[PDB]
Amino acid sequence: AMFYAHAFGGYDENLHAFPGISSTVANDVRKYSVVSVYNKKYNIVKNKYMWCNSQVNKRYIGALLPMFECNEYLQIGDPIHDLEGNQISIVTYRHKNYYALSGIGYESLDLCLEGVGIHHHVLETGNAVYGKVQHEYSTIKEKAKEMNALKPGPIIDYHVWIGDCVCQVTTVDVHGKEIMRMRFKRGAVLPIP
Amino acid sequence: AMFYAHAFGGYDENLHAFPGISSTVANDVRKYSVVSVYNKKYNIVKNKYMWCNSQVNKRYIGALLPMFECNEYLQIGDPIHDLEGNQISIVTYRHKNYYALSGIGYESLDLCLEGVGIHHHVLETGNAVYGKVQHEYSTIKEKAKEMNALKPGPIIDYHVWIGDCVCQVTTVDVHGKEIMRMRFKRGAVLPIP
Ligand SMILES: Nc1ncnc2c1ncn2[C@@H]1O[C@@H]2COP(=O)(O)O[C@@H]3[C@H](F)[C@@H](COP(=O)(O)O[C@H]2[C@H]1F)C[C@H]3n1cnc2c(=O)[nH]cnc21
Ligand SMILES: Nc1ncnc2c1ncn2[C@@H]1O[C@@H]2COP(=O)(O)O[C@@H]3[C@H](F)[C@@H](COP(=O)(O)O[C@H]2[C@H]1F)C[C@H]3n1cnc2c(=O)[nH]cnc21
């Protein structure tokens, strides 16, 4: 089983594709509660995930992934094993002491990037979204009221909103009108570069 | 608290919008395990949902909703209560003996329909999808290989795939190329008209 890091040129369009990884196998990583890195065991966090993406050859690969808590500093490519000793992933993304476990995970977004853009945001708890912006509900409501009369044009930009209680994806046309929204009912964080 | 059925002309763009319902309140229906209809109690099904949508004024309102199991025949608009006696929803969609509980639910899709289409499919367990079609994995892989060289155009059609283990939404351009995919990691059924 082989795992190649996108950050080091490892994308291969004929292999399984996950955020940060091209692999010869497709592991369902939702099932693990404990993993091992350099013979140290780490617990998977319950009920909170990490929204991770890689962008390679004009292809966006994004998903909500399990994460484990680790006070050691780990680096891209470090092999991640199950407790039986099999390698199941590699280190890819981190948020402080949380490390993503990349593989088949929770909700996902795959997208052809040619002709569009995509942006990621931390969603403040209690805020509302319209289109490309977040703000207080009453501010957003006023914005939505103004944009209601516009005729919807083609999607040109994607906005990913990652919150403690909900995640969502919005899309806009060139005039800023919201065209489509999807909501994922899970809480998560974004990686910190 | 008022609940108006979209099937009977009840859409109101200034009220909370859920599949089949415009309401003066926004109830989180994920929390209920038991509901009441005409003073009979019904259990909510665990770990399996119903993908429901209404299409009103060129607006698509779709979501994965809890469902309860009921051997009585119920009709659109029948009031659904919590066990404290408060009305929390109305009957909207059914799949045999399953009835959707519409409100704030699980994963959702909101979409402006002007200029695009949308279609719903039962996803056969074990099948793969590309674009507007499902089939056996090796058939779909051959299709994807043919379409790989095409340049992505604007989204014109949405396809909703509802399976026992996963739900997904794909989008295509006028040439049938897949532009974007979202996956929801929950199992569900579609309503039966
Ligand atoms: N070589 C093969 N690889 C994979 N599946 C294969 C293969 N041969 C046959 N099949 C069958 O085909 C269907 C379609 O699966 P599909 O790839 O559409 O997506 C699936 C589903 F959303 C979910 C469970 O699906 P499952 O119930 O297992 O059904 C499968 C399976 F029965 C996991 C997800 N998933 C799989 N791989 C990747 C990946 O690389 N990236 C991102 N997500 C991935
Ligand atoms: N009058 C108000 N109504 C609603 N929220 C209000 C209001 N005033 C202030 N707020 C705050 O604003 C944010 C943005 O919520 P938003 O509407 O974006 O979507 C939310 C989230 F995805 C999820 C939990 O969000 P929550 O943590 O409660 O945060 C809220 C809240 F703090 C439920 C979902 N949801 C709410 N209503 C509907 C609806 O009618 N249809 C479909 N989904 C709906």
Side-chain angles (χ1 to χ4, degrees), chain A residues 1-30 32-39 41-45 47 49-131 133-141 143-144 146-150 152-181 183-193, chain B residues 1-30 32-39 41-45 47 49-131 133-141 143-144 146-150 152-181 183-193:
Chain A
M2 300 305 300
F3 307 84
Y4 302 107
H6 293 169
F8 302 144
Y11 177 61
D12 182 337
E13 64 175 17
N14 293 305
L15 293 184
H16 297 279
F18 310 106
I21 297 178
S22 289
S23 180
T24 60
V25 300
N27 294 332
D28 186 342
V29 295
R30 299 176 293 164
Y32 301 98
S33 298
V34 184
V35 301
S36 180
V37 186
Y38 296 129
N39 300 288
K41 300 181 187 172
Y42 302 106
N43 297 316
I44 294 282
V45 176
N47 297 313
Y49 310 100
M50 193 180 303
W51 179 268
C52 297
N53 75 94
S54 49
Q55 297 175 37
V56 291
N57 285 4
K58 306 199 162 74
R59 179 187 178 173
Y60 178 92
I61 304 159
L64 284 176
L65 295 174
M67 59 199 189
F68 55 99
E69 189 165 353
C70 171
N71 286 326
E72 283 71 54
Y73 191 91
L74 306 173
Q75 293 180 58
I76 296 169
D78 289 343
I80 306 168
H81 297 85
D82 66 23
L83 266 48
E84 287 95 314
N86 314 310
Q87 188 179 355
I88 61 170
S89 185
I90 54 155
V91 165
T92 52
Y93 302 95
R94 84 182 65 74
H95 175 111
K96 293 173 182 185
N97 297 319
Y98 300 138
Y99 288 81
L101 176 60
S102 184
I104 301 161
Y106 297 99
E107 282 65 38
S108 67
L109 177 61
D110 292 278
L111 166 70
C112 300
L113 289 167
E114 188 166 9
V116 301
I118 189 155
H119 314 268
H120 306 81
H121 313 275
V122 178
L123 178 65
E124 190 91 88
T125 304
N127 267 6
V129 175
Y130 180 91
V133 302
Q134 67 176 298
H135 221 298
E136 306 176 346
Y137 195 91
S138 62
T139 295
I140 290 301
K141 184 179 185 184
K143 175 62 174 173
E146 299 166 351
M147 307 292 285
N148 196 45
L150 298 192
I155 291 170
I156 57 111
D157 259 320
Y158 288 72
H159 292 270
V160 178
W161 308 90
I162 303 300
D164 294 330
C165 309
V166 59
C167 294
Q168 42 202 349
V169 182
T170 60
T171 53
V172 296
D173 68 13
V174 294
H175 290 92
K177 192 191 173 72
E178 188 173 309
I179 308 306
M180 179 264 294
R181 181 180 298 215
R183 302 179 191 97
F184 309 140
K185 298 308 184 71
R186 304 196 209 260
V189 304
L190 281 169
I192 291 163
Chain B
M2 300 305 300
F3 307 84
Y4 302 107
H6 293 169
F8 302 144
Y11 177 61
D12 182 337
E13 64 175 17
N14 293 305
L15 293 184
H16 297 279
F18 310 106
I21 297 178
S22 289
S23 180
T24 60
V25 300
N27 294 332
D28 186 342
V29 295
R30 299 176 293 164
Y32 301 98
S33 298
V34 184
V35 301
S36 180
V37 186
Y38 296 129
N39 300 288
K41 300 181 187 172
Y42 302 106
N43 297 316
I44 294 282
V45 176
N47 297 313
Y49 310 100
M50 193 180 303
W51 179 268
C52 297
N53 75 94
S54 49
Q55 297 175 37
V56 291
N57 285 4
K58 306 199 162 74
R59 179 187 178 173
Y60 178 92
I61 304 159
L64 284 176
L65 295 174
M67 59 199 189
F68 55 99
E69 189 165 353
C70 171
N71 286 326
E72 283 71 54
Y73 191 91
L74 306 173
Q75 293 180 58
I76 296 169
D78 289 343
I80 306 168
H81 297 85
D82 66 23
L83 266 48
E84 287 95 314
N86 314 310
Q87 188 179 355
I88 61 170
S89 185
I90 54 155
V91 165
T92 52
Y93 302 95
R94 84 182 65 74
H95 175 111
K96 293 173 182 185
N97 297 319
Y98 300 138
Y99 288 81
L101 176 60
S102 184
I104 301 161
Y106 297 99
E107 282 65 38
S108 67
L109 177 61
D110 292 278
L111 166 70
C112 300
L113 289 167
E114 188 166 9
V116 301
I118 189 155
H119 314 268
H120 306 81
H121 313 275
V122 178
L123 178 65
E124 190 91 88
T125 304
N127 267 6
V129 175
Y130 180 91
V133 302
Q134 67 176 298
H135 221 298
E136 306 176 346
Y137 195 91
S138 62
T139 295
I140 290 301
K141 184 179 185 184
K143 175 62 174 173
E146 299 166 351
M147 307 292 285
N148 196 45
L150 298 192
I155 291 170
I156 57 111
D157 259 320
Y158 288 72
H159 292 270
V160 178
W161 308 90
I162 303 300
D164 294 330
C165 309
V166 59
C167 294
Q168 42 202 349
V169 182
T170 60
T171 53
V172 296
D173 68 13
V174 294
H175 290 92
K177 192 191 173 72
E178 188 173 309
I179 308 306
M180 179 264 294
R181 181 180 298 215
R183 302 179 191 97
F184 309 140
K185 298 308 184 71
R186 304 196 209 260
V189 304
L190 281 169
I192 291 163

